[PDB]
């Protein structure tokens, strides 16, 4: 099997299509996916179909060029956990305002499947781009 670090990098480091396919291939059936409360898509979603409807489809439809760029990956001692420090950027369609916001994503894997994801994000900056 591919290393966990490689699996996680594969959800960010390629084209949008390769990233999306890689993520879907790696998600466990009952993956628990948490967007930060202050982020517009905040909440916890169980399974790929809820994640697509409530999160990724909206990142595509409400923003132009929504992008997540990782600056560091960290492998956690004594866990199957990968922590990514990164930056988001994008333009909110309704306002035309661009933003940048720093994030951390905490990924947990079991037997090489992604079983948990949690977003931490500088949500004030995201929300400011949404303000007319």
Max distance between CA atoms of the chain, in angstroms, equals 48
Residue 1 binds which entry of Na ion, its own copies, none, CB below 5-8 Å type-dependent: none
Binding residue count for its own copies, defined by CB under 8 A: 28
Check if the beta carbon of residue 42 is closer than 8 Å to that of residue 33.
no
Beta carbons within 10 angstroms of residue 106's beta carbon? 16
Is 96 among the residues that bind Na ion (CB under 5 A)?
no
CA 54 from centre of chain: 12
**Which residues are CB-neighbours of 57 under 8 A, at least 6 positions away?**
none
Residue 55 binds which entry of Na ion, its own copies, none, CB below 5-8 Å type-dependent: none
- Considering only 14, 38, 60, 96, the residue that binds Na ion (CB under 5 A) is 60
- Residue 85 backbone dihedrals phi, psi, to 5 degrees: -95, 130
- Considering only 7, 26, 68, 126, the residue that binds its own copies (CB under 8 A) is 126
Nearer to Na ion, 40 or 44 (CB): 40
Binding-site ranges for its own copies (CB under 8 A): 36-39, 74-79, 81, 83, 85, 101-104, 106, 118, 120-128
Binding-site ranges for Na ion (CB under 5 A): 60, 75-76
């Amino acid at each position: 099997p591919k290393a966990n670090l490689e699996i996680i990098r594969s959800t960010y480091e390629g084209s949008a299509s390769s990233n999306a396919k890689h993520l879907a291939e790696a998600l466990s059936e009952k993956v628990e996916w948490t967007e930060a409360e202050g982020f517009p898509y905040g909440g916890t979603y169980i399974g790929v179909e809820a994640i697509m409807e409530n999160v990724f489809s909206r990142l595509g439809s409400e923003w132009n060029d929504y992008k997540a760029s990782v600056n560091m990956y960290h492998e956690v001692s004594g866990k199957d956990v990968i922590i990514a420090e990164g930056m988001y950027s994008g333009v909110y369609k309704d306002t035309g305002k661009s933003f940048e916001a720093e994030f951390v994503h905490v990924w947990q894997l079991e037997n090489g499947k992604i079983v948990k994801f949690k977003q931490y994000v500088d949500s004030h900056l995201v929300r400011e781009a949404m303000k007319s």
